[PDB]
Amino acid sequence: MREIVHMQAGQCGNQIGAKFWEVISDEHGIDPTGTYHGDSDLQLERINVYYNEATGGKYVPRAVLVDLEPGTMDSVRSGPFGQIFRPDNFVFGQSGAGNNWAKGHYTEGAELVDSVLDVVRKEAESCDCLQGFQLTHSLGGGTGSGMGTLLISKIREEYPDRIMNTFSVVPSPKVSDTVVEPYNATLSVHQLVENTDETYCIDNEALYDICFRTLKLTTPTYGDLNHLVSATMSGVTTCLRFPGQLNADLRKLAVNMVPFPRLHFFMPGFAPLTSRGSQQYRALTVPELTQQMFDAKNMMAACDPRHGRYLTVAAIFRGRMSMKEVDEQMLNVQNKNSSYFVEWIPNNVKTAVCDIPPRGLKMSATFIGNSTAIQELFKRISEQFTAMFRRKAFLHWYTGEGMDEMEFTEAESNMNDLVSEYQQYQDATAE
């Protein structure tokens, strides 16, 4: 009866939460009204992980939706699966952060943090285990980043021994889609580094490339991308809800990934992702399932692991499936090329096997790769920040509400320290 309090922060956060709750309501067999219409008892045996209890056969999510603009809350309420959400967990403002980390953290937004911590306390001590909290936020927005970082700071101050994963839509390398996004990304990572426990860096351009090259789809919209991110969420927290031959929970995954506390930025990944017409050309077995999951095309982040070294790799396999082949392929990728693998960790693969496949699949897999190749994304964010900061561009907006350049210099000091730490643990030898 371990469980997670889910949190949606920002416009991106509310859309990602809506699609995530849709996909796991479909996973557990729950209609938009909130009633169980599934057939298997395994779909209902562990439902307190994400769902609370209401009057009747209702099943409300244990989610808190936070926004400073009313339009996104309007969309989530009035779209599909809006009936299932509680009206009191819709905590929101009216003015708007306006793409400013300062205006989402220090001024208004710190005016909502008391109410949001009230609701987080509400559904946090309305529990018995509370494995942890989840924040599906975006880096590059005002209330996506500043509000999210403030909430993570307060929640980690109150409950410091609990899993605090974040899903961190990071800025794209090419085509910015936001101007002050290097400022927001640097000043938000500066809080995530010593606040969160684990972070799944997801990139919109990489999701576009997946939905275009692999799944064809030509027009990939946002529902498809959001369903990939939500399927990654299910592939992460599937062994905690469903029985497996060898299951792994959030604490177990965190322990087997991070070797040092400031190394919790990972690579999402899902398999199989094949098109409609290519679904009847490829066999769906363990070898294809692991090679399409280790493919660098399939990397849900925006940095090639070919130039870089894996620290650790998590493979969460799913389905009634043999696992001698699973262990043999986890061995075989390392033995084929251990050059893209740290030699000071001998067997750097954590493996979980769950019995119940995701709804609509026979057998699937999920990738969580702690790599030293993510340092180039952080270096890119740092160089964009200092390029836009040495001329003090877009700085009056942040300094008007109560911070100064000292905080930006501290953020860059921490950022470059983590970049050097990744370089050190990449180039470090065994002896």
């Binding site: 339009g71 009035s78 819709f90 529902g223």
Partner: protein, 101 residues
Amino acid sequence: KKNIDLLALEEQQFQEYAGKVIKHCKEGERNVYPLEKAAREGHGGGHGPVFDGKGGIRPSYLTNDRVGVELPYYQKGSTDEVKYAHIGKPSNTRKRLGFVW
């Protein structure tokens, strides 16, 4: 279930009185529009959908500020048409991304 049926009885008992007064005012040739705006289906002050699955209640989503201010409604027909013109009944995202089984 009896509570849900009581809410249904509440709505069907209010609406006959509302229809009687609306018909009388329409016979008397009034504006009718404030009465028709007040006599909306649902059981709350929100401007949202009726939410027929949850006993037909338009919940009250409120802003945390000095004076409450309800969450508005923006979903039109043309916006929904161009929203679902490419994706097509949003449960089809799963079927579009493979996920056939």
